[PDB]
Amino acid sequence: GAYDAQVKNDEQDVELADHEARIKQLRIDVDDHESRITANTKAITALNVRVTTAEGEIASLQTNVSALDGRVTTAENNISALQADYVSKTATTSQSLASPLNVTTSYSVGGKKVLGARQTGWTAATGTANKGVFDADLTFAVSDTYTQSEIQAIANALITERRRTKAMEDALRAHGLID
Protein backbone atom coordinates (compact mmCIF):
# COMPACT_ATOMS: atom_id res chain seq x y z
CA GLY A 1 0.00 0.00 0.00
CA ALA A 2 1.21 3.47 0.91
CA TYR A 3 1.23 4.51 -2.75
CA ASP A 4 -2.56 4.26 -3.07
CA ALA A 5 -3.09 7.16 -0.65
CA GLN A 6 -0.98 9.58 -2.70
CA VAL A 7 -2.76 8.45 -5.87
CA LYS A 8 -6.12 8.97 -4.15
CA ASN A 9 -5.26 12.46 -2.88
CA ASP A 10 -4.00 13.54 -6.31
CA GLU A 11 -7.09 12.26 -8.12
CA GLN A 12 -9.29 13.90 -5.48
CA ASP A 13 -7.38 17.11 -6.18
CA VAL A 14 -8.05 16.66 -9.90
CA GLU A 15 -11.78 16.39 -9.25
CA LEU A 16 -11.70 19.38 -6.90
CA ALA A 17 -10.07 21.47 -9.63
CA ASP A 18 -12.76 20.34 -12.08
CA HIS A 19 -15.57 21.18 -9.65
CA GLU A 20 -13.97 24.56 -8.96
CA ALA A 21 -13.87 25.49 -12.65
CA ARG A 22 -17.45 24.35 -13.28
CA ILE A 23 -18.78 26.19 -10.23
CA LYS A 24 -17.06 29.36 -11.47
CA GLN A 25 -18.76 29.06 -14.86
CA LEU A 26 -22.14 28.32 -13.29
CA ARG A 27 -21.70 31.42 -11.14
CA ILE A 28 -20.91 33.48 -14.25
CA ASP A 29 -23.96 32.16 -16.09
CA VAL A 30 -26.37 32.64 -13.19
CA ASP A 31 -25.08 36.17 -12.54
CA ASP A 32 -25.68 36.79 -16.24
CA HIS A 33 -29.18 35.32 -16.03
CA GLU A 34 -30.04 37.47 -13.00
CA SER A 35 -29.50 40.73 -14.91
CA ARG A 36 -31.24 39.60 -18.11
CA ILE A 37 -34.48 38.20 -16.68
CA THR A 38 -34.70 41.24 -14.38
CA ALA A 39 -34.47 43.36 -17.52
CA ASN A 40 -37.22 41.24 -19.08
CA THR A 41 -39.45 41.68 -16.02
CA LYS A 42 -39.02 45.45 -16.25
CA ALA A 43 -39.72 45.32 -19.99
CA ILE A 44 -42.87 43.25 -19.47
CA THR A 45 -44.06 45.62 -16.74
CA ALA A 46 -43.52 48.60 -19.05
CA LEU A 47 -45.38 46.87 -21.89
CA ASN A 48 -48.47 46.33 -19.73
CA VAL A 49 -48.59 50.09 -19.11
CA ARG A 50 -48.54 50.87 -22.83
CA VAL A 51 -51.04 48.14 -23.69
CA THR A 52 -53.33 49.36 -20.91
CA THR A 53 -53.09 52.92 -22.23
CA ALA A 54 -53.85 51.70 -25.76
CA GLU A 55 -56.84 49.70 -24.51
CA GLY A 56 -57.96 52.91 -22.84
CA GLU A 57 -57.84 54.69 -26.19
CA ILE A 58 -59.44 51.88 -28.29
CA ALA A 59 -62.68 51.47 -26.30
CA SER A 60 -62.90 55.28 -26.31
CA LEU A 61 -62.54 55.32 -30.11
CA GLN A 62 -65.09 52.52 -30.51
CA THR A 63 -67.59 54.67 -28.63
CA ASN A 64 -66.94 57.81 -30.68
CA VAL A 65 -67.14 55.91 -33.98
CA SER A 66 -70.46 54.43 -32.86
CA ALA A 67 -71.72 57.89 -31.90
CA LEU A 68 -70.60 59.39 -35.21
CA ASP A 69 -72.24 56.50 -37.06
CA GLY A 70 -75.53 57.45 -35.42
CA ARG A 71 -75.09 61.12 -36.29
CA VAL A 72 -74.35 60.42 -39.95
CA THR A 73 -77.29 58.02 -40.24
CA THR A 74 -79.49 60.77 -38.79
CA ALA A 75 -77.96 63.27 -41.21
CA GLU A 76 -78.44 61.00 -44.24
CA ASN A 77 -82.12 60.65 -43.34
CA ASN A 78 -82.51 64.42 -43.01
CA ILE A 79 -80.89 64.85 -46.42
CA SER A 80 -83.16 62.23 -48.00
CA ALA A 81 -86.23 63.97 -46.59
CA LEU A 82 -85.04 67.31 -47.97
CA GLN A 83 -84.17 65.90 -51.41
CA ALA A 84 -87.74 64.67 -51.88
CA ASP A 85 -89.46 67.70 -50.35
CA TYR A 86 -87.50 70.75 -51.52
CA VAL A 87 -88.34 73.06 -54.43
CA SER A 88 -85.64 73.01 -57.11
CA LYS A 89 -84.36 75.99 -59.10
CA THR A 90 -83.25 73.75 -61.96
CA ALA A 91 -85.96 71.08 -62.20
CA THR A 92 -87.97 71.34 -65.42
CA THR A 93 -90.98 69.21 -64.47
CA SER A 94 -93.76 71.29 -62.91
CA GLN A 95 -93.56 71.47 -59.12
CA SER A 96 -96.54 71.70 -56.78
CA LEU A 97 -96.97 73.09 -53.27
CA ALA A 98 -99.57 71.87 -50.78
CA SER A 99 -99.72 75.38 -49.32
CA PRO A 100 -100.49 78.96 -50.40
CA LEU A 101 -97.58 81.13 -51.53
CA ASN A 102 -96.51 84.67 -50.64
CA VAL A 103 -93.68 86.57 -52.33
CA THR A 104 -92.09 90.01 -52.17
CA THR A 105 -92.87 92.59 -54.86
CA SER A 106 -93.64 90.48 -57.94
CA TYR A 107 -94.40 87.22 -59.68
CA SER A 108 -92.70 86.76 -63.06
CA VAL A 109 -92.97 84.34 -65.98
CA GLY A 110 -89.95 83.80 -68.23
CA GLY A 111 -88.22 86.81 -66.73
CA LYS A 112 -90.98 89.38 -67.24
CA LYS A 113 -93.20 90.64 -64.42
CA VAL A 114 -96.83 89.62 -64.86
CA LEU A 115 -98.10 90.05 -61.32
CA GLY A 116 -97.46 92.68 -58.68
CA ALA A 117 -99.01 94.23 -55.59
CA ARG A 118 -102.80 94.65 -55.39
CA GLN A 119 -103.97 97.84 -57.07
CA THR A 120 -105.94 99.98 -54.64
CA GLY A 121 -108.22 103.00 -54.79
CA TRP A 122 -111.11 101.18 -56.46
CA THR A 123 -114.77 101.80 -55.73
CA ALA A 124 -116.63 98.54 -56.33
CA ALA A 125 -119.16 98.68 -59.16
CA THR A 126 -122.74 97.82 -58.20
CA GLY A 127 -125.55 96.09 -60.06
CA THR A 128 -125.80 93.09 -62.38
CA ALA A 129 -122.78 91.20 -63.74
CA ASN A 130 -122.94 89.76 -67.26
CA LYS A 131 -120.90 86.61 -67.88
CA GLY A 132 -123.28 85.19 -70.48
CA VAL A 133 -123.65 85.45 -74.26
CA PHE A 134 -121.89 88.53 -75.61
CA ASP A 135 -121.27 89.44 -79.25
CA ALA A 136 -118.65 92.13 -79.89
CA ASP A 137 -119.57 92.19 -83.58
CA LEU A 138 -123.06 93.43 -82.73
CA THR A 139 -123.90 96.39 -84.97
CA PHE A 140 -126.64 99.03 -84.89
CA ALA A 141 -129.00 100.46 -87.50
CA VAL A 142 -129.12 104.27 -87.61
CA SER A 143 -131.74 105.86 -89.86
CA ASP A 144 -131.87 109.49 -90.98
CA THR A 145 -135.00 110.02 -88.89
CA TYR A 146 -135.52 109.37 -85.17
CA THR A 147 -136.38 105.72 -84.51
CA GLN A 148 -137.10 104.75 -80.88
CA SER A 149 -136.32 101.07 -81.45
CA GLU A 150 -132.87 101.94 -82.81
CA ILE A 151 -132.01 104.08 -79.79
CA GLN A 152 -133.35 101.36 -77.49
CA ALA A 153 -131.05 98.83 -79.16
CA ILE A 154 -128.02 101.05 -78.54
CA ALA A 155 -129.03 101.64 -74.92
CA ASN A 156 -129.66 97.92 -74.43
CA ALA A 157 -126.20 97.03 -75.73
CA LEU A 158 -124.66 99.71 -73.53
CA ILE A 159 -126.25 98.08 -70.49
CA THR A 160 -124.98 94.60 -71.42
CA GLU A 161 -121.54 96.15 -71.91
CA ARG A 162 -121.54 97.91 -68.53
CA ARG A 163 -122.72 94.69 -66.89
CA ARG A 164 -119.85 92.80 -68.54
CA THR A 165 -117.39 95.41 -67.26
CA LYS A 166 -118.65 94.76 -63.73
CA ALA A 167 -118.35 91.00 -64.23
CA MET A 168 -114.71 91.39 -65.25
CA GLU A 169 -114.13 93.73 -62.31
CA ASP A 170 -115.73 91.17 -60.01
CA ALA A 171 -113.27 88.55 -61.27
CA LEU A 172 -110.28 90.81 -60.64
CA ARG A 173 -111.52 91.64 -57.14
CA ALA A 174 -112.15 87.99 -56.27
CA HIS A 175 -108.62 87.04 -57.34
CA GLY A 176 -107.15 90.07 -55.59
CA LEU A 177 -105.60 92.14 -58.38
CA ILE A 178 -107.72 95.10 -57.28
CA ASP A 179 -109.35 96.13 -54.01
Next chain:
Amino acid sequence: GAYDAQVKNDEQDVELADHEARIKQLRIDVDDHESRITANTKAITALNVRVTTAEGEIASLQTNVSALDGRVTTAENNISALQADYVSKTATTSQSLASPLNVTTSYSVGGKKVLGARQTGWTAATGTANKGVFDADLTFAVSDTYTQSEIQAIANALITERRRTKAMEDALRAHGLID
Protein backbone atom coordinates in the same frame (compact mmCIF):
# COMPACT_ATOMS: atom_id res chain seq x y z
CA GLY B 1 6.57 13.11 5.58
CA ALA B 2 3.48 11.83 7.36
CA TYR B 3 2.44 15.37 8.26
CA ASP B 4 1.80 16.35 4.62
CA ALA B 5 -1.12 13.91 4.34
CA GLN B 6 -3.00 15.44 7.27
CA VAL B 7 -2.35 18.92 5.88
CA LYS B 8 -3.61 17.77 2.47
CA ASN B 9 -6.79 16.20 3.85
CA ASP B 10 -7.59 19.30 5.91
CA GLU B 11 -7.09 21.68 2.99
CA GLN B 12 -9.16 19.37 0.77
CA ASP B 13 -11.85 19.57 3.46
CA VAL B 14 -11.61 23.37 3.38
CA GLU B 15 -12.19 23.38 -0.38
CA LEU B 16 -15.06 20.90 -0.04
CA ALA B 17 -16.75 23.20 2.47
CA ASP B 18 -16.29 26.12 0.07
CA HIS B 19 -17.73 24.17 -2.85
CA GLU B 20 -20.65 23.04 -0.69
CA ALA B 21 -21.57 26.61 0.27
CA ARG B 22 -21.29 27.90 -3.30
CA ILE B 23 -23.36 25.03 -4.71
CA LYS B 24 -26.05 25.79 -2.13
CA GLN B 25 -26.19 29.43 -3.21
CA LEU B 26 -26.24 28.51 -6.90
CA ARG B 27 -29.13 26.15 -6.16
CA ILE B 28 -30.98 28.97 -4.39
CA ASP B 29 -30.42 31.38 -7.28
CA VAL B 30 -31.41 28.91 -10.00
CA ASP B 31 -34.54 27.87 -8.09
CA ASP B 32 -35.33 31.58 -7.86
CA HIS B 33 -34.70 32.05 -11.58
CA GLU B 34 -36.95 29.10 -12.46
CA SER B 35 -40.02 30.72 -10.88
CA ARG B 36 -39.36 34.22 -12.22
CA ILE B 37 -38.73 33.44 -15.90
CA THR B 38 -41.71 31.06 -15.83
CA ALA B 39 -43.76 34.00 -14.58
CA ASN B 40 -42.35 36.12 -17.41
CA THR B 41 -43.25 33.46 -19.99
CA LYS B 42 -46.82 33.42 -18.70
CA ALA B 43 -46.90 37.23 -18.73
CA ILE B 44 -45.61 37.36 -22.31
CA THR B 45 -48.16 34.75 -23.39
CA ALA B 46 -50.95 36.78 -21.80
CA LEU B 47 -49.73 39.98 -23.47
CA ASN B 48 -49.90 38.41 -26.93
CA VAL B 49 -53.57 37.63 -26.31
CA ARG B 50 -54.36 41.24 -25.42
CA VAL B 51 -52.29 42.66 -28.28
CA THR B 52 -53.98 40.25 -30.70
CA THR B 53 -57.40 41.32 -29.42
CA ALA B 54 -56.43 44.99 -29.80
CA GLU B 55 -55.16 44.37 -33.34
CA GLY B 56 -58.51 42.75 -33.99
CA GLU B 57 -60.26 45.94 -32.88
CA ILE B 58 -57.92 48.42 -34.66
CA ALA B 59 -58.25 47.04 -38.22
CA SER B 60 -62.00 46.89 -37.57
CA LEU B 61 -62.00 50.56 -36.54
CA GLN B 62 -59.86 51.54 -39.53
CA THR B 63 -62.52 50.01 -41.78
CA ASN B 64 -65.44 51.75 -40.09
CA VAL B 65 -63.68 55.13 -40.12
CA SER B 66 -62.99 54.67 -43.83
CA ALA B 67 -66.64 53.76 -44.44
CA LEU B 68 -67.88 56.75 -42.43
CA ASP B 69 -65.46 59.00 -44.33
CA GLY B 70 -67.13 57.90 -47.56
CA ARG B 71 -70.61 58.49 -46.15
CA VAL B 72 -69.79 62.00 -44.94
CA THR B 73 -68.14 62.91 -48.25
CA THR B 74 -71.30 61.72 -50.00
CA ALA B 75 -73.42 63.72 -47.54
CA GLU B 76 -71.35 66.89 -47.97
CA ASN B 77 -71.84 66.66 -51.74
CA ASN B 78 -75.59 66.20 -51.32
CA ILE B 79 -75.68 69.26 -49.07
CA SER B 80 -73.67 71.34 -51.55
CA ALA B 81 -76.06 70.38 -54.35
CA LEU B 82 -79.05 71.37 -52.21
CA GLN B 83 -77.51 74.67 -51.08
CA ALA B 84 -77.15 75.81 -54.69
CA ASP B 85 -80.47 74.44 -55.93
CA TYR B 86 -83.00 75.10 -53.16
CA VAL B 87 -85.48 77.98 -52.93
CA SER B 88 -84.83 80.16 -49.88
CA LYS B 89 -87.46 81.75 -47.63
CA THR B 90 -85.06 84.49 -46.55
CA ALA B 91 -83.09 85.33 -49.71
CA THR B 92 -83.84 88.83 -51.00
CA THR B 93 -82.45 88.52 -54.53
CA SER B 94 -85.10 87.35 -57.01
CA GLN B 95 -85.18 83.57 -57.45
CA SER B 96 -86.07 81.78 -60.67
CA LEU B 97 -87.48 78.32 -61.40
CA ALA B 98 -86.86 76.37 -64.60
CA SER B 99 -90.30 74.78 -64.22
CA PRO B 100 -93.97 75.80 -63.96
CA LEU B 101 -95.43 76.29 -60.48
CA ASN B 102 -98.62 75.06 -58.82
CA VAL B 103 -99.83 76.13 -55.38
CA THR B 104 -102.81 75.52 -53.11
CA THR B 105 -105.53 78.17 -52.81
CA SER B 106 -103.69 81.44 -53.47
CA TYR B 107 -100.71 83.46 -54.62
CA SER B 108 -99.91 86.51 -52.49
CA VAL B 109 -97.65 89.56 -52.76
CA GLY B 110 -96.45 91.28 -49.60
CA GLY B 111 -98.97 89.35 -47.53
CA LYS B 112 -102.11 90.20 -49.50
CA LYS B 113 -103.81 87.74 -51.85
CA VAL B 114 -103.67 88.84 -55.48
CA LEU B 115 -104.33 85.56 -57.24
CA GLY B 116 -106.72 82.71 -56.50
CA ALA B 117 -108.55 79.86 -58.19
CA ARG B 118 -109.82 80.28 -61.76
CA GLN B 119 -113.22 81.97 -61.86
CA THR B 120 -115.73 79.81 -63.70
CA GLY B 121 -119.19 80.18 -65.19
CA TRP B 122 -118.11 82.41 -68.06
CA THR B 123 -119.54 82.29 -71.56
CA ALA B 124 -116.81 83.38 -73.96
CA ALA B 125 -117.55 86.58 -75.86
CA THR B 126 -117.54 86.30 -79.64
CA GLY B 127 -116.52 88.70 -82.40
CA THR B 128 -113.69 91.18 -82.89
CA ALA B 129 -111.17 92.09 -80.19
CA ASN B 130 -109.84 95.66 -80.03
CA LYS B 131 -106.31 96.09 -78.68
CA GLY B 132 -105.51 99.12 -80.82
CA VAL B 133 -105.89 102.89 -80.44
CA PHE B 134 -108.49 103.76 -77.81
CA ASP B 135 -109.28 107.19 -76.37
CA ALA B 136 -111.30 107.23 -73.14
CA ASP B 137 -111.62 111.01 -73.35
CA LEU B 138 -113.61 110.72 -76.57
CA THR B 139 -116.72 112.90 -76.31
CA PHE B 140 -119.91 113.16 -78.35
CA ALA B 141 -121.88 116.06 -79.82
CA VAL B 142 -125.61 115.98 -79.06
CA SER B 143 -127.79 118.57 -80.82
CA ASP B 144 -131.36 119.51 -79.92
CA THR B 145 -132.57 117.95 -83.18
CA TYR B 146 -132.02 114.42 -84.49
CA THR B 147 -128.66 114.10 -86.25
CA GLN B 148 -127.84 110.71 -87.80
CA SER B 149 -124.08 111.33 -87.78
CA GLU B 150 -124.15 112.03 -84.03
CA ILE B 151 -126.00 108.79 -83.27
CA GLN B 152 -123.64 106.90 -85.57
CA ALA B 153 -120.67 108.29 -83.64
CA ILE B 154 -122.13 107.05 -80.35
CA ALA B 155 -122.89 103.63 -81.84
CA ASN B 156 -119.41 103.45 -83.36
CA ALA B 157 -117.77 104.17 -80.01
CA LEU B 158 -119.99 101.61 -78.32
CA ILE B 159 -118.73 98.98 -80.76
CA THR B 160 -115.07 99.85 -80.15
CA GLU B 161 -115.79 99.67 -76.43
CA ARG B 162 -117.46 96.25 -76.63
CA ARG B 163 -114.58 95.00 -78.78
CA ARG B 164 -112.10 96.23 -76.16
CA THR B 165 -114.06 94.42 -73.45
CA LYS B 166 -113.68 91.19 -75.43
CA ALA B 167 -109.96 91.83 -75.90
CA MET B 168 -109.51 92.20 -72.14
CA GLU B 169 -111.62 89.08 -71.58
CA ASP B 170 -109.47 87.22 -74.10
CA ALA B 171 -106.37 88.18 -72.11
CA LEU B 172 -107.87 86.92 -68.85
CA ARG B 173 -108.93 83.65 -70.47
CA ALA B 174 -105.51 83.09 -72.05
CA HIS B 175 -103.78 83.59 -68.70
CA GLY B 176 -106.37 81.46 -66.92
CA LEU B 177 -108.07 83.83 -64.48
CA ILE B 178 -111.42 82.97 -66.03
CA ASP B 179 -112.76 79.97 -67.95
Next chain:
Amino acid sequence: GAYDAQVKNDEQDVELADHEARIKQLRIDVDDHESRITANTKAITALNVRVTTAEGEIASLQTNVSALDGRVTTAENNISALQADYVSKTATTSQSLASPLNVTTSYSVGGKKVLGARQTGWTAATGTANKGVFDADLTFAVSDTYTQSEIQAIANALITERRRTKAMEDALRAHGLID
Protein backbone atom coordinates in the same frame (compact mmCIF):
# COMPACT_ATOMS: atom_id res chain seq x y z
CA GLY C 1 -4.61 5.82 13.82
CA ALA C 2 -4.05 4.67 10.26
CA TYR C 3 -7.73 3.77 9.90
CA ASP C 4 -8.87 7.41 10.16
CA ALA C 5 -7.17 8.32 6.86
CA GLN C 6 -9.07 5.67 4.87
CA VAL C 7 -12.31 6.75 6.52
CA LYS C 8 -11.53 10.38 5.67
CA ASN C 9 -10.71 9.64 2.02
CA ASP C 10 -13.89 7.60 1.58
CA GLU C 11 -16.12 10.26 3.13
CA GLN C 12 -14.38 12.91 1.02
CA ASP C 13 -15.16 10.72 -1.99
CA VAL C 14 -18.80 10.56 -0.90
CA GLU C 15 -18.99 14.36 -0.78
CA LEU C 16 -17.23 14.65 -4.15
CA ALA C 17 -19.83 12.35 -5.70
CA ASP C 18 -22.60 14.47 -4.17
CA HIS C 19 -21.07 17.70 -5.47
CA GLU C 20 -20.62 16.13 -8.90
CA ALA C 21 -24.28 15.16 -9.16
CA ARG C 22 -25.52 18.55 -7.97
CA ILE C 23 -23.22 20.44 -10.34
CA LYS C 24 -24.55 18.32 -13.21
CA GLN C 25 -28.14 19.23 -12.33
CA LEU C 26 -27.29 22.91 -11.92
CA ARG C 27 -25.65 22.80 -15.35
CA ILE C 28 -28.80 21.23 -16.81
CA ASP C 29 -31.05 23.86 -15.22
CA VAL C 30 -28.90 26.83 -16.23
CA ASP C 31 -28.59 25.54 -19.80
CA ASP C 32 -32.38 25.25 -19.77
CA HIS C 33 -32.73 28.78 -18.40
CA GLU C 34 -30.40 30.18 -21.06
CA SER C 35 -32.66 29.07 -23.92
CA ARG C 36 -35.93 30.09 -22.26
CA ILE C 37 -35.06 33.65 -21.18
CA THR C 38 -33.44 34.21 -24.57
CA ALA C 39 -36.75 33.18 -26.10
CA ASN C 40 -38.52 35.61 -23.77
CA THR C 41 -36.18 38.45 -24.77
CA LYS C 42 -36.94 37.78 -28.44
CA ALA C 43 -40.67 37.63 -27.65
CA ILE C 44 -40.53 40.92 -25.74
CA THR C 45 -38.60 42.56 -28.58
CA ALA C 46 -41.20 41.37 -31.08
CA LEU C 47 -44.05 42.63 -28.89
CA ASN C 48 -42.60 46.15 -28.79
CA VAL C 49 -42.68 46.21 -32.60
CA ARG C 50 -46.37 45.28 -32.70
CA VAL C 51 -47.30 47.67 -29.89
CA THR C 52 -45.37 50.46 -31.62
CA THR C 53 -47.19 49.74 -34.88
CA ALA C 54 -50.54 49.75 -33.06
CA GLU C 55 -49.68 53.04 -31.35
CA GLY C 56 -48.89 54.35 -34.81
CA GLU C 57 -52.38 53.38 -35.96
CA ILE C 58 -54.28 54.61 -32.85
CA ALA C 59 -53.04 58.24 -32.84
CA SER C 60 -53.76 58.25 -36.58
CA LEU C 61 -57.32 57.05 -35.94
CA GLN C 62 -57.82 59.58 -33.14
CA THR C 63 -56.96 62.32 -35.62
CA ASN C 64 -59.31 61.06 -38.34
CA VAL C 65 -62.19 60.62 -35.89
CA SER C 66 -61.63 64.17 -34.67
CA ALA C 67 -61.59 65.44 -38.26
CA LEU C 68 -64.76 63.53 -39.13
CA ASP C 69 -66.41 64.86 -35.97
CA GLY C 70 -65.76 68.38 -37.24
CA ARG C 71 -67.12 67.56 -40.69
CA VAL C 72 -70.34 66.05 -39.33
CA THR C 73 -70.88 68.98 -36.96
CA THR C 74 -70.47 71.30 -39.95
CA ALA C 75 -72.87 69.14 -41.96
CA GLU C 76 -75.49 69.04 -39.19
CA ASN C 77 -75.42 72.85 -39.04
CA ASN C 78 -75.83 73.10 -42.81
CA ILE C 79 -78.81 70.74 -42.61
CA SER C 80 -80.39 72.73 -39.78
CA ALA C 81 -80.04 75.95 -41.78
CA LEU C 82 -81.67 74.30 -44.80
CA GLN C 83 -84.51 72.75 -42.79
CA ALA C 84 -85.58 76.19 -41.54
CA ASP C 85 -85.03 78.05 -44.81
CA TYR C 86 -86.22 75.71 -47.58
CA VAL C 87 -89.59 75.76 -49.35
CA SER C 88 -91.53 72.54 -48.79
CA LYS C 89 -93.66 70.69 -51.35
CA THR C 90 -95.76 69.08 -48.62
CA ALA C 91 -96.15 71.81 -45.99
CA THR C 92 -99.75 73.03 -45.69
CA THR C 93 -99.16 76.27 -43.80
CA SER C 94 -98.66 79.23 -46.16
CA GLN C 95 -95.02 79.87 -47.00
CA SER C 96 -93.51 83.29 -47.68
CA LEU C 97 -90.48 84.42 -49.68
CA ALA C 98 -88.48 87.57 -48.95
CA SER C 99 -87.72 87.86 -52.67
CA PRO C 100 -89.54 88.18 -56.01
CA LEU C 101 -90.32 84.98 -57.91
CA ASN C 102 -89.84 83.96 -61.54
CA VAL C 103 -91.13 80.73 -63.08
CA THR C 104 -91.19 79.04 -66.47
CA THR C 105 -94.39 79.06 -68.53
CA SER C 106 -97.16 79.23 -65.92
CA TYR C 107 -98.45 79.74 -62.41
CA SER C 108 -101.21 77.36 -61.34
CA VAL C 109 -103.66 77.08 -58.44
CA GLY C 110 -105.02 73.68 -57.47
CA GLY C 111 -103.70 72.17 -60.68
CA LYS C 112 -105.27 74.61 -63.15
CA LYS C 113 -103.29 77.33 -64.91
CA VAL C 114 -104.38 80.82 -63.88
CA LEU C 115 -101.35 82.83 -64.94
CA GLY C 116 -99.12 82.67 -68.00
CA ALA C 117 -96.79 84.79 -70.09
CA ARG C 118 -97.54 88.49 -70.58
CA GLN C 119 -99.96 89.09 -73.43
CA THR C 120 -98.46 91.44 -75.99
CA GLY C 121 -99.64 93.48 -78.97
CA TRP C 122 -101.59 96.00 -76.91
CA THR C 123 -101.84 99.69 -77.69
CA ALA C 124 -102.29 101.54 -74.40
CA ALA C 125 -105.61 103.36 -74.05
CA THR C 126 -105.37 107.10 -73.43
CA GLY C 127 -107.50 109.51 -71.42
CA THR C 128 -109.27 109.38 -68.06
CA ALA C 129 -109.55 106.25 -65.92
CA ASN C 130 -112.71 105.68 -63.88
CA LYS C 131 -112.30 103.72 -60.65
CA GLY C 132 -115.09 105.53 -58.81
CA VAL C 133 -118.84 105.03 -58.40
CA PHE C 134 -120.26 102.84 -61.16
CA ASP C 135 -123.76 101.38 -61.41
CA ALA C 136 -124.22 98.55 -63.91
CA ASP C 137 -127.98 98.61 -63.33
CA LEU C 138 -128.19 102.14 -64.73
CA THR C 139 -131.03 102.30 -67.26
CA PHE C 140 -132.04 104.84 -69.89
CA ALA C 141 -135.33 106.47 -70.87
CA VAL C 142 -136.11 106.37 -74.59
CA SER C 143 -139.14 108.33 -75.79
CA ASP C 144 -140.87 108.01 -79.16
CA THR C 145 -139.67 111.51 -80.09
CA TYR C 146 -136.12 112.88 -80.12
CA THR C 147 -135.06 114.06 -76.66
CA GLN C 148 -131.59 115.63 -76.36
CA SER C 149 -131.32 114.92 -72.62
CA GLU C 150 -131.98 111.21 -73.20
CA ILE C 151 -129.25 110.95 -75.84
CA GLN C 152 -126.89 112.91 -73.59
CA ALA C 153 -127.53 110.43 -70.77
CA ILE C 154 -126.62 107.51 -73.04
CA ALA C 155 -123.49 109.27 -74.27
CA ASN C 156 -122.53 110.19 -70.70
CA ALA C 157 -122.82 106.57 -69.56
CA LEU C 158 -120.81 105.43 -72.58
CA ILE C 159 -117.99 107.74 -71.52
CA THR C 160 -118.00 106.48 -67.93
CA GLU C 161 -117.94 102.94 -69.32
CA ARG C 162 -115.00 103.61 -71.65
CA ARG C 163 -113.14 105.30 -68.79
CA ARG C 164 -113.74 102.23 -66.61
CA THR C 165 -112.40 99.99 -69.38
CA LYS C 166 -109.20 102.04 -69.38
CA ALA C 167 -108.96 101.83 -65.59
CA MET C 168 -109.17 98.04 -65.75
CA GLU C 169 -106.62 98.01 -68.57
CA ASP C 170 -104.34 100.22 -66.48
CA ALA C 171 -104.54 97.68 -63.65
CA LEU C 172 -103.63 94.79 -65.95
CA ARG C 173 -100.70 96.74 -67.41
CA ALA C 174 -99.39 97.74 -63.98
CA HIS C 175 -99.44 94.12 -62.81
CA GLY C 176 -97.95 92.92 -66.08
CA LEU C 177 -100.62 90.69 -67.61
CA ILE C 178 -100.56 92.84 -70.74
CA ASP C 179 -97.98 95.11 -72.36
